[PDB]
Coordinates of C-alpha atoms in Angstrom, one line a residue:
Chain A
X1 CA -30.1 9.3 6.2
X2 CA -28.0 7.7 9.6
X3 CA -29.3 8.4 12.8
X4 CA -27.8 5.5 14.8
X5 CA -24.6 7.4 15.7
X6 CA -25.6 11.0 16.5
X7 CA -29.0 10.6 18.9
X8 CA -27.4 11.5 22.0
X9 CA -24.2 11.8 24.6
X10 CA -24.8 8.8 27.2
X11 CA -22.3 7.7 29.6
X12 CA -22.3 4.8 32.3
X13 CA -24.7 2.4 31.8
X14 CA -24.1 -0.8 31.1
X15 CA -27.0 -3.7 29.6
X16 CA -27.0 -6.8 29.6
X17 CA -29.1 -8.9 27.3
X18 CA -29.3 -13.2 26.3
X19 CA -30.0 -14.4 22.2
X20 CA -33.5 -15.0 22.1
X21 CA -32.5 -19.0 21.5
X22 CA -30.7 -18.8 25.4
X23 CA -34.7 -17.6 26.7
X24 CA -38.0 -18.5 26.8
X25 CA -40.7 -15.5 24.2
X26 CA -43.5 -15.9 27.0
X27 CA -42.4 -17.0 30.2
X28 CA -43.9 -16.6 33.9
X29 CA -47.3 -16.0 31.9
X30 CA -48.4 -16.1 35.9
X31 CA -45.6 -15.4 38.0
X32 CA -45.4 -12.2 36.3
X33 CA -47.3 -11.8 32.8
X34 CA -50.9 -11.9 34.4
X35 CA -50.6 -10.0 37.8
X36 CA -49.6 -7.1 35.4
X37 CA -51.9 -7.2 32.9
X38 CA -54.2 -6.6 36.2
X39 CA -51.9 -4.5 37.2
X40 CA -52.7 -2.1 34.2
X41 CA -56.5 -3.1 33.9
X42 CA -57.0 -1.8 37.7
X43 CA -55.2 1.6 37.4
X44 CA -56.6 2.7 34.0
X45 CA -60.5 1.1 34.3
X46 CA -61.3 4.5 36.7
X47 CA -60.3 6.8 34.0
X48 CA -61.7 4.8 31.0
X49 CA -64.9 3.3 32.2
X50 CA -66.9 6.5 33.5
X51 CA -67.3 8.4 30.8
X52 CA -68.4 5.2 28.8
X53 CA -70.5 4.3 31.5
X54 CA -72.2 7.5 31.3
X55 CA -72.7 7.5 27.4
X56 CA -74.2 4.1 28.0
X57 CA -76.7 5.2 30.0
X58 CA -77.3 8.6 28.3
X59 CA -78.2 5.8 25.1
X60 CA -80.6 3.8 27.4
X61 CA -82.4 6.7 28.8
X62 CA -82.7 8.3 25.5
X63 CA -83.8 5.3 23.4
X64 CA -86.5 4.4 26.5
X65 CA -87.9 7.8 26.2
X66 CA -88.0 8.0 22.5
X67 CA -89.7 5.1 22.5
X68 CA -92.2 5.8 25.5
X69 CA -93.1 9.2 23.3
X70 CA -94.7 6.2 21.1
X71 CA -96.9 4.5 22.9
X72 CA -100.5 6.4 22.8
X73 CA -101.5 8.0 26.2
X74 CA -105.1 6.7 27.0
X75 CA -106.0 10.0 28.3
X76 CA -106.4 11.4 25.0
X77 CA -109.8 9.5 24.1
X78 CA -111.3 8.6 27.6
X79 CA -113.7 11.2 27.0
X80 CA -114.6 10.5 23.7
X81 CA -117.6 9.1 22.0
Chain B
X2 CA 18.8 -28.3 4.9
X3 CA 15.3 -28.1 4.0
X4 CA 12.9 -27.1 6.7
X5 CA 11.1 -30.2 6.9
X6 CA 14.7 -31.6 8.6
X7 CA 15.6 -29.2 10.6
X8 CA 12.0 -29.8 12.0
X9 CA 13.0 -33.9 13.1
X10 CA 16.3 -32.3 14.4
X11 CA 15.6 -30.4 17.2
X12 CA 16.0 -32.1 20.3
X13 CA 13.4 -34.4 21.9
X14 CA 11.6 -32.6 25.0
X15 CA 12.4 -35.4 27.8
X16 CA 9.9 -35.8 31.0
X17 CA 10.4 -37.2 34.4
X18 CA 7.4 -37.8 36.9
X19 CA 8.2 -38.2 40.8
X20 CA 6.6 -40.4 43.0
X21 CA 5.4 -37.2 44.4
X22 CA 3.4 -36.6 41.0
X23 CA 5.6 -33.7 39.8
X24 CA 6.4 -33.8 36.6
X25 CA 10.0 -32.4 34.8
X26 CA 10.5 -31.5 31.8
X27 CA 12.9 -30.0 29.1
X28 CA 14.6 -29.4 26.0
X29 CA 18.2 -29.4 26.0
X30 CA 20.0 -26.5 23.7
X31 CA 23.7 -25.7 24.2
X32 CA 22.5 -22.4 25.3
X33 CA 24.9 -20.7 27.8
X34 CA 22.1 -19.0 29.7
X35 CA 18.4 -20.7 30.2
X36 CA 14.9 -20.8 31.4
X37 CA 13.6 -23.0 34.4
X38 CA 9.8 -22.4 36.0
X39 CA 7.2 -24.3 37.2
X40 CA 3.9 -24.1 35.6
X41 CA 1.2 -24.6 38.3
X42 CA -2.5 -25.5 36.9
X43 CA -4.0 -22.9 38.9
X44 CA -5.9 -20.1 38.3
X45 CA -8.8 -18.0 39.0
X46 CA -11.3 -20.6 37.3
X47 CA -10.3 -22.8 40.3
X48 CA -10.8 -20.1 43.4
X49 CA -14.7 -19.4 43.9
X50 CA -16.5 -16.2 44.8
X51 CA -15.2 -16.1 48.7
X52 CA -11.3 -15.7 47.3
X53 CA -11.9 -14.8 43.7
X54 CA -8.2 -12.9 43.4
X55 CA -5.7 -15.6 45.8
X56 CA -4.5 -17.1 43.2
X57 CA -3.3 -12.9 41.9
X58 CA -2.3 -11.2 46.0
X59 CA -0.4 -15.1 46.1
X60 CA 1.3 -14.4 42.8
X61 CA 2.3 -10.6 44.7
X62 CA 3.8 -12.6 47.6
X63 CA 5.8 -15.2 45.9
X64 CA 8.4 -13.0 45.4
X65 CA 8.3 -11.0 48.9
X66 CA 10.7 -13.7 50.6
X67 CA 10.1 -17.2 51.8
X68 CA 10.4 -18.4 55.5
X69 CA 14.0 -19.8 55.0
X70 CA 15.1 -16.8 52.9
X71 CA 13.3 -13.0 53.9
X72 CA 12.7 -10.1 51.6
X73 CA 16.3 -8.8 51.1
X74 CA 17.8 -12.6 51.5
X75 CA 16.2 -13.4 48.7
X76 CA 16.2 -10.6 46.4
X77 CA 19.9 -10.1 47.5
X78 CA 20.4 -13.5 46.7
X79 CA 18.6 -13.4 42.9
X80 CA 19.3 -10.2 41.9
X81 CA 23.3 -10.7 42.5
X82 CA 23.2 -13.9 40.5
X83 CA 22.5 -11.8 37.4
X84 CA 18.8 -14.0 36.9
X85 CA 15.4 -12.8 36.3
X86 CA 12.4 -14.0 38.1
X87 CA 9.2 -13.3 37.2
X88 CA 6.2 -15.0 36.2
X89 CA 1.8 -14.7 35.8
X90 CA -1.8 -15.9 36.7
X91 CA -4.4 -16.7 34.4
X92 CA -7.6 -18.0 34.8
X93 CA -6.6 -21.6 34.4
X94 CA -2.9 -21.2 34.6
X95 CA -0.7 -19.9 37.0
X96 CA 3.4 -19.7 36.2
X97 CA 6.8 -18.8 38.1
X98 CA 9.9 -18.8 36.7
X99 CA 13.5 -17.7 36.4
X100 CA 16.3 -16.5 33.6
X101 CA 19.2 -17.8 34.4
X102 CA 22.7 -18.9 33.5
X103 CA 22.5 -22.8 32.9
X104 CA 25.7 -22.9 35.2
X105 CA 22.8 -21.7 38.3
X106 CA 20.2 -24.4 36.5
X107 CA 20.5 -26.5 39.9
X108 CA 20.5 -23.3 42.6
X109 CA 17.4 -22.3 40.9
X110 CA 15.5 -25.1 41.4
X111 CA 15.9 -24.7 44.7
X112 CA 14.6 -21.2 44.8
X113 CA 11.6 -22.3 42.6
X114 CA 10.8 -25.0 45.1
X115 CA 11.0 -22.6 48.0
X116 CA 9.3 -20.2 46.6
X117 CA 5.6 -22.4 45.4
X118 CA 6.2 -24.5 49.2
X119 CA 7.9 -22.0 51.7
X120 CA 6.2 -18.6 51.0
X121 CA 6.8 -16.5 53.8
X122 CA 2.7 -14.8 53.4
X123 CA 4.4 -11.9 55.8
X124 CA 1.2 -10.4 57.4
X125 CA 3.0 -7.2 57.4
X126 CA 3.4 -7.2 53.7
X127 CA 0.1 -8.6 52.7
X128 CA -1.5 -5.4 53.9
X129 CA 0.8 -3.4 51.5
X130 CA 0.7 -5.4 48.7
X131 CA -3.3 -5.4 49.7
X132 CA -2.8 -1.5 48.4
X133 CA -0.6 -2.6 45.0
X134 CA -3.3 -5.0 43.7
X135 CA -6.0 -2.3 44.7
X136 CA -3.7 0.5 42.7
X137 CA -2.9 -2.0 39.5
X138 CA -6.9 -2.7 39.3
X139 CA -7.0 1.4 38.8
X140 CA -4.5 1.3 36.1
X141 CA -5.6 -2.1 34.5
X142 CA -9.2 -0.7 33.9
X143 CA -8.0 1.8 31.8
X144 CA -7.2 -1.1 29.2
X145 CA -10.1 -1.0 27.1
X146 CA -8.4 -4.1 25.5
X147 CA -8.6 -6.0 29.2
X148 CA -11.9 -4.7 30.4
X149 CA -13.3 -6.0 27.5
X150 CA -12.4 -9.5 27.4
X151 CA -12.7 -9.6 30.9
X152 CA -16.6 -8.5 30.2
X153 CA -16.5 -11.1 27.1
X154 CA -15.7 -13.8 29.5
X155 CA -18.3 -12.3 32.0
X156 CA -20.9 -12.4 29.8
X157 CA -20.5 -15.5 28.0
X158 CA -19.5 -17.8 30.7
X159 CA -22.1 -15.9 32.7
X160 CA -22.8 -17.5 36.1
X161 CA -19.7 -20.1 35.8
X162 CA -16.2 -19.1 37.4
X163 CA -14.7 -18.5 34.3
X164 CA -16.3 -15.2 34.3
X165 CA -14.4 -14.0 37.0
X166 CA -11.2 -11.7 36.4
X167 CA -8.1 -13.1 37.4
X168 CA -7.2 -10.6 39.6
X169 CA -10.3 -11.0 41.4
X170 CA -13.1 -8.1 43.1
X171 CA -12.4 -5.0 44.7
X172 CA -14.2 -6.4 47.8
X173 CA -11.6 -9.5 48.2
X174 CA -8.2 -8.1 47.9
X175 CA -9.9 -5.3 50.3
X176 CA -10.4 -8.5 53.0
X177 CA -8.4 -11.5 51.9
X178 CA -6.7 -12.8 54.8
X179 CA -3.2 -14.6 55.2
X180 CA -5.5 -17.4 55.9
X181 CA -7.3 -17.3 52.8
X182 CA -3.9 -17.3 50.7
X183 CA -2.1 -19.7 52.9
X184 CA -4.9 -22.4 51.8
X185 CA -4.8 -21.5 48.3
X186 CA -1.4 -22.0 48.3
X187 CA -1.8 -25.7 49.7
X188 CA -5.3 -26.7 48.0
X189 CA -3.5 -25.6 45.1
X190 CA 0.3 -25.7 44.5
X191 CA 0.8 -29.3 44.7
X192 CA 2.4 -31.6 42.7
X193 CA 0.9 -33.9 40.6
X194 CA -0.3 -30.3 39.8
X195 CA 2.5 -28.7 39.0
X196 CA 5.1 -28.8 36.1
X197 CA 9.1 -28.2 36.3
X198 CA 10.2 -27.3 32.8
X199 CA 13.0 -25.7 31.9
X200 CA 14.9 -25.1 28.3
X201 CA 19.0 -24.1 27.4
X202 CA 21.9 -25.4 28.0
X203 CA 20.7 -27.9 31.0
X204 CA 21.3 -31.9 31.6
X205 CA 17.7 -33.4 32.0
X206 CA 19.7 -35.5 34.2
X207 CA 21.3 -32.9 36.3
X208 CA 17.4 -31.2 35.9
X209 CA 15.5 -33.9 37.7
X210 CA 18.0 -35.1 40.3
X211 CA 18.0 -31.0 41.7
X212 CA 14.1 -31.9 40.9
X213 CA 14.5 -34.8 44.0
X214 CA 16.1 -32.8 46.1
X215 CA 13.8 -29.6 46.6
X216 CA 11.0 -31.2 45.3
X217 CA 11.0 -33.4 47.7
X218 CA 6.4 -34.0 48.8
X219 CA 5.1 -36.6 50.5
X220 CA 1.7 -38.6 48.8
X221 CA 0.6 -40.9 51.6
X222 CA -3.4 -40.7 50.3
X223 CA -4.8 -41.7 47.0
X224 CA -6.6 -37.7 47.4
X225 CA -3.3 -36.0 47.2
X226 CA -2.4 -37.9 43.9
X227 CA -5.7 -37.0 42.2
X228 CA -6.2 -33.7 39.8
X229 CA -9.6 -32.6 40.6
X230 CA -11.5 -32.2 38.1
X231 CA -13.6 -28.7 37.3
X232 CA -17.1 -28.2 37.2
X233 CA -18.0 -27.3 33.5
X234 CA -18.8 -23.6 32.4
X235 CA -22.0 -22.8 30.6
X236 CA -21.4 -20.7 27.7
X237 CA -24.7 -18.4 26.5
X238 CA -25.3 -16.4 23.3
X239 CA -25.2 -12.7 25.2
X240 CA -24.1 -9.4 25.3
X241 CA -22.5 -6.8 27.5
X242 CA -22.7 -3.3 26.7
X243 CA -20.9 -0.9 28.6
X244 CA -21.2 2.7 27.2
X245 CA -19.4 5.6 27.6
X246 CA -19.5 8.4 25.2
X247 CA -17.1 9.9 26.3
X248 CA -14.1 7.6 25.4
X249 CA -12.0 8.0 21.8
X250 CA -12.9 4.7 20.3
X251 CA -15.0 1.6 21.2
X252 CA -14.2 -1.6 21.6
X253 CA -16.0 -4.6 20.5
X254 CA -15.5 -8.4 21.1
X255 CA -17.4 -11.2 19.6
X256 CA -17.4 -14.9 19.9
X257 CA -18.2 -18.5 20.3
X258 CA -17.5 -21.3 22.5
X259 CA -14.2 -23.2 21.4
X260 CA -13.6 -26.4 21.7
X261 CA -10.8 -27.0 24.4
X262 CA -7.0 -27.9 24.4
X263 CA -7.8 -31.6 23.2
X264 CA -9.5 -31.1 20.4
X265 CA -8.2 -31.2 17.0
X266 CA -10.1 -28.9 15.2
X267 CA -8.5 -25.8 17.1
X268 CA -5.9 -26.6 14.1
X269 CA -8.1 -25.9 11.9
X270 CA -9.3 -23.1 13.8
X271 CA -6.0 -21.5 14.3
X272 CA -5.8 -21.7 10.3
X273 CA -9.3 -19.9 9.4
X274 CA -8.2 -17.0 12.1
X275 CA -5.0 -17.2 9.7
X276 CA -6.8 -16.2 6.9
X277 CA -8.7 -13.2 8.5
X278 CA -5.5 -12.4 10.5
X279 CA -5.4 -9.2 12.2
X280 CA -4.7 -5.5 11.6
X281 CA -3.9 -2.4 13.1
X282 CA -3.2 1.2 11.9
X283 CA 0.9 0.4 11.4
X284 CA 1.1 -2.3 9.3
X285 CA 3.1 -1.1 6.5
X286 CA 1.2 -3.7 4.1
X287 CA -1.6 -1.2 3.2
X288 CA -4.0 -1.5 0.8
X289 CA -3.1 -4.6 -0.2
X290 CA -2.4 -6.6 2.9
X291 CA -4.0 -10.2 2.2
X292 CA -6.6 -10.0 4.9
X293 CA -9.8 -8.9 3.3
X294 CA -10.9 -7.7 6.0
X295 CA -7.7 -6.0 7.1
X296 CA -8.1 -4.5 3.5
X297 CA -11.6 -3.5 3.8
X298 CA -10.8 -2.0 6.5
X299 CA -7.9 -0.3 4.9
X300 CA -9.9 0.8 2.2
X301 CA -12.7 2.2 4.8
X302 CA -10.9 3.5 7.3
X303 CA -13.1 0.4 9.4
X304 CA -10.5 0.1 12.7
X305 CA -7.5 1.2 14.4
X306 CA -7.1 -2.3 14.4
X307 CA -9.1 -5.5 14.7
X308 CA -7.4 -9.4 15.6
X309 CA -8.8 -12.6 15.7
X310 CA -8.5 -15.1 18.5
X311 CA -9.2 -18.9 19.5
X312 CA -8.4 -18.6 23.2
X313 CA -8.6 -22.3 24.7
X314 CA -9.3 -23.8 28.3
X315 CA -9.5 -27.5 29.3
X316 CA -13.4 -28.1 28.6
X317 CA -14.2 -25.0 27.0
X318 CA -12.9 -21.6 25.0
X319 CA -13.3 -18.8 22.9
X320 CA -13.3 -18.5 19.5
X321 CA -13.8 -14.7 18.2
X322 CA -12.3 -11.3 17.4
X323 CA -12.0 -8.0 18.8
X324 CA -11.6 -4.6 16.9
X325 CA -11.5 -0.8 18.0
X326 CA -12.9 1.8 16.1
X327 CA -14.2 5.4 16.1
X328 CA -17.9 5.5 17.1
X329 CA -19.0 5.6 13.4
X330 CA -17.4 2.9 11.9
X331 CA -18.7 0.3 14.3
X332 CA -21.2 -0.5 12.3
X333 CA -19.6 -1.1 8.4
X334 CA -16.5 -2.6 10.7
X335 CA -18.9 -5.1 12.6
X336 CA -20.5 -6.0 8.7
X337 CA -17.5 -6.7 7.1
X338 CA -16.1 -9.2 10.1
X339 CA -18.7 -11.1 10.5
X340 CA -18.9 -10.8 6.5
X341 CA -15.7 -12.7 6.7
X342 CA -16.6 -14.9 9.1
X343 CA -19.6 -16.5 6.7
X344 CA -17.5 -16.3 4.2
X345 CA -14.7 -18.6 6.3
X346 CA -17.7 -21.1 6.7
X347 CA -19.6 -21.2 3.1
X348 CA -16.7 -20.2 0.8
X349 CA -12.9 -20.5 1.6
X350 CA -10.4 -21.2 -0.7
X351 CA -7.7 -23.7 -1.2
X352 CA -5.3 -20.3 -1.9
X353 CA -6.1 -19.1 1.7
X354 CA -5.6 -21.7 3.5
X355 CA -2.1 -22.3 1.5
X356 CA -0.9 -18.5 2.8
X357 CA -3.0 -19.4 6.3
X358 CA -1.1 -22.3 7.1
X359 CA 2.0 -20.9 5.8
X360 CA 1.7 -17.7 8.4
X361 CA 0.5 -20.6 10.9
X362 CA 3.7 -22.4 11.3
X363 CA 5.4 -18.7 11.4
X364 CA 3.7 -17.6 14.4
X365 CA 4.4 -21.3 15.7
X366 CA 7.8 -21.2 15.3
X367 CA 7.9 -17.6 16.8
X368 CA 6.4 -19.2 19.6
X369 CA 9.7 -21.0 20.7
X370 CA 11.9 -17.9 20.0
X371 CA 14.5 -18.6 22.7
X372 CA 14.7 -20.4 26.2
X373 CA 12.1 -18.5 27.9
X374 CA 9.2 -19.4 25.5
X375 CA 10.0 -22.3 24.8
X376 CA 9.6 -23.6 28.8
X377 CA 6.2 -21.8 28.5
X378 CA 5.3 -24.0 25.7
X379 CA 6.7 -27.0 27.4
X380 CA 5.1 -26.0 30.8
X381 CA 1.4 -25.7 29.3
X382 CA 1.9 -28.5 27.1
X383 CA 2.3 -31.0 29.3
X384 CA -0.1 -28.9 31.8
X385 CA -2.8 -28.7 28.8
X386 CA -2.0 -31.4 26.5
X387 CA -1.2 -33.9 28.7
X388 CA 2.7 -34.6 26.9
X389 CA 4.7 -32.3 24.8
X390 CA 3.7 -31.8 20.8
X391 CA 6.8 -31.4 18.3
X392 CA 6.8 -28.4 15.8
X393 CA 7.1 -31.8 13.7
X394 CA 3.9 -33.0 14.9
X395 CA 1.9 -29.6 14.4
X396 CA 3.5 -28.8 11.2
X397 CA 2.3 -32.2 10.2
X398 CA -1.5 -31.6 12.0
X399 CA -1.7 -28.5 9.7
X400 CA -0.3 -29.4 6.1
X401 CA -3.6 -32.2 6.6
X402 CA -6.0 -28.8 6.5
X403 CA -7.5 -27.8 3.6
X404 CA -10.3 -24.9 2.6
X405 CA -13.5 -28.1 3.0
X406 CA -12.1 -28.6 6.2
X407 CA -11.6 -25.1 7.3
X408 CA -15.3 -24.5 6.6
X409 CA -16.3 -27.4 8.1
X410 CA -14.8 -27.1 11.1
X411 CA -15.9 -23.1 11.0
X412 CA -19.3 -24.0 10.1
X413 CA -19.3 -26.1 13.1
X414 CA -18.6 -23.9 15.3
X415 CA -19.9 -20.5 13.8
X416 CA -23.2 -21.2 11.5
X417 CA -25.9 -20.0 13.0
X418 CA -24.7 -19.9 16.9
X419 CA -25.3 -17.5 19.4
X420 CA -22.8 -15.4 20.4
X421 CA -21.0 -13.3 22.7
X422 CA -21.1 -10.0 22.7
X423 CA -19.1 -7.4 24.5
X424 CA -18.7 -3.7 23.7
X425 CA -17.2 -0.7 25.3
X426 CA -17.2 3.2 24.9
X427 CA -19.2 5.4 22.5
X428 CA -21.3 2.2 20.9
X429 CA -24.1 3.7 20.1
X430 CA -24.1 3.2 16.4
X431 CA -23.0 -0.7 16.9
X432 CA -26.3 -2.0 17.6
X433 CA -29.1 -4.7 18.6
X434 CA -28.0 -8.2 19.2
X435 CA -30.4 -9.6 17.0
X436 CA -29.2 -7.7 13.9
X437 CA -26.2 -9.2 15.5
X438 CA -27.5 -12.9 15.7
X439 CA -28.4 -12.8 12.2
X440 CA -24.7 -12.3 10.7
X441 CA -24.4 -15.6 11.9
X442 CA -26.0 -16.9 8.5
X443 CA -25.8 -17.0 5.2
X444 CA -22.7 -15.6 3.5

């Protein structure tokens, strides 16, 4: 039923927040939004990106050699008649 | 003797201005003892960050001993003359006065005078009184009840000097220096500033000649006759939360920017807080005190008590309540007043305001319940209102509110604004200002 009341013992801090009317919703989109987006991008791309990277390639490489396994290898009939 | 007549009976409050710009004033009673005081428009909205608290170590000092008069000479002095001296600092208002028997109405103006112009700012007991203030601010923040407007005004006059405490930061009574309070004292104290007022068995006459004498500055300049005016404070929909689970209750504060002394409406605002009153775990009424919410809250167990308030200031002012309550009740207790506080705008009645007005001029009268406030009224009158207003007047200001203009006026002021938030102690289930913003409509 109620939570808001029991969650936990906090002491000291004090917050201090404006109406949403007082502010702007998006504000210092470069001054601050942007540079952190970045931010984020940079320090997570070394972690994500390999192992996709690889799985890329492991598609390439396979699809190629399937498809090599297709063409007909003239050595097969150069010594027929 | 119908009330209505002995309204138009009491005596006319009579004001004198000097060529110095001081005004006196009084109202005249056949009272053997009286009330005389000057009431300085000064306060901490006028000091700035460098000697936020002057305006409080002063008010510690003006009672020390002049230059003409020491410590003991003075004291000696007042205390054997049976009187009382005493007075306070606001933010916008600063006060001194004295309880006297209107036979010493003339001595006493003398001591008032030498007290705002010859302070004696002894350097030796600045540095102890330097230790008082610092000891009071240990006690004083161990009044929920202050802290808590204090943080109200900090929060919604944000950034302005009205969010400053009147008795200033720890840093400046720490480093204040005679200096710093000897210039307050003469940016400040002066007297097209200042307001002699006094109430009881006193000749106006007799009043303003002793007024002359003492009160005797020079205006050679057309800057010393000017009253600056303030720089106007910013008021912002916010909130301050300060918890601490481990206090017994909470407090919480909300509110809106009032109008200001001069404006009529407050009327009308002082009836609609007269409807929703204000409560508290004593009142013998119970159950069935008139106050919904004071009933709700009954009937809840919502509050060891809740008021309302319409605190006003020359441009600005606050318009809210405050309530403390056990740290799961906060919630329902929040509901319910700003509950009320639609229901003030979208649906009062002609019945509540009838018993609101009634309680109105109740409290007013109350308000000049002997010498001592009645000076205070006459002091900040003239200080805030600019001349004096007759129970007459004000009795007559409120019989012209009704319930449309009650929710006017509140919807004005209320509907759908952003307000102030301040809350103290174990608030964890009173929660999110937007849930908060949202009780500001419909209901």
């Amino acid at each position: 039923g109620i939570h808001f009341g029991n969650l936990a013992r906090v002491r000291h801090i004090i917050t201090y927040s404006l109406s949403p009317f007082e502010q702007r919703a998006i504000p210092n989109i470069f001054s601050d939004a942007l540079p952190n987006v970045w931010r984020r991008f940079s320090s997570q791309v070394f972690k994500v990106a390999p192992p996709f990277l690889g799985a890329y390639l492991l598609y390439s490489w396979g699809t190629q050699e399937f498809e090599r396994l297709k063409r007909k290898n003239p050595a097969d009939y150069e010594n027929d008649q | 003797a119908t009330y209505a007549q002995t309204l138009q009976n009491i005596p006319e409050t009579n004001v004198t201005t000097l060529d110095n710009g001081l005004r006196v004033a009084s109202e005249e009673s056949s009272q053997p003892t009286c009330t005389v005081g000057v009431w300085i428009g000064a306060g901490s909205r006028y000091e700035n960050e460098k000697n936020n608290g002057a305006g409080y170590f002063v008010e510690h000092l003006a009672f020390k001993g002049t230059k003409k008069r020491p410590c003991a000479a003075f004291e000696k002095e007042v205390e054997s003359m049976g009187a009382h001296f005493n007075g306070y600092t606001s933010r916008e208002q600063t006060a001194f006065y004295i309880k006297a028997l209107s036979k010493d109405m003339p001595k006493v103006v003398e001591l008032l005078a030498d007290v705002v112009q010859n302070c004696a700012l002894e350097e030796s007991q600045i540095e102890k009184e330097r230790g008082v203030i610092l000891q009071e601010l240990k006690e004083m923040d161990n009044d929920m009840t202050n802290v808590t407007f204090d943080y109200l005004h900090a929060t919604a006059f944000q950034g302005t000097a009205l969010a400053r405490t009147v008795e200033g930061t720890t840093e400046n009574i720490k480093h204040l220096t005679r200096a710093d309070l000897a210039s307050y004292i003469d940016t400040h104290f002066k007297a097209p500033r200042m307001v002699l007022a006094a109430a009881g068995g006193i000749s106006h006459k007799e009043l303003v000649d002793a007024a002359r004498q003492h009160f005797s500055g020079v205006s050679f300049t057309y800057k010393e006759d000017a009253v600056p005016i303030l720089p106007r404070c910013r008021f912002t929909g916010s909130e301050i939360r300060a918890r601490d689970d481990a206090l017994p209750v909470a407090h919480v504060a909300l509110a809106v920017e009032g109008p200001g002394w001069a404006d009529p409406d407050n009327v009308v605002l002082h009836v609609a807080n007269a409807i929703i009153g204000r409560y508290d775990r004593t009142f013998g009424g119970g159950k069935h005190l008139s106050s919904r919410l004071a009933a709700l809250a009954v009937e809840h167990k919502l509050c060891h008590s809740f008021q309302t308030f319409n605190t006003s200031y020359s441009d600005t002012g606050l318009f809210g309540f405050h309530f403390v309550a056990d740290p799961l009740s906060i919630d329902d207790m929040m509901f319910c007043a700003q509950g009320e506080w639609m229901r003030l705008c979208t649906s009062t009645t002609e019945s509540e305001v009838k018993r609101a007005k009634n309680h109105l001029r109740s409290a007013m009268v109350a308000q000049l319940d002997g010498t001592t406030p009645v000076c205070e009224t006459i002091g900040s009158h003239l200080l805030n209102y600019g001349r004096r207003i007759s129970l007459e007047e004000w009795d007559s200001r409120i019989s012209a509110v009704d319930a449309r203009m009650v929710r006017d006026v509140c919807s004005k002021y209320i509907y759908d604004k952003c307000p102030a938030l301040a809350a103290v102690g174990p608030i964890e289930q009173l929660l999110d200002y937007n849930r908060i913003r949202s009780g500001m409509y419909w209901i």
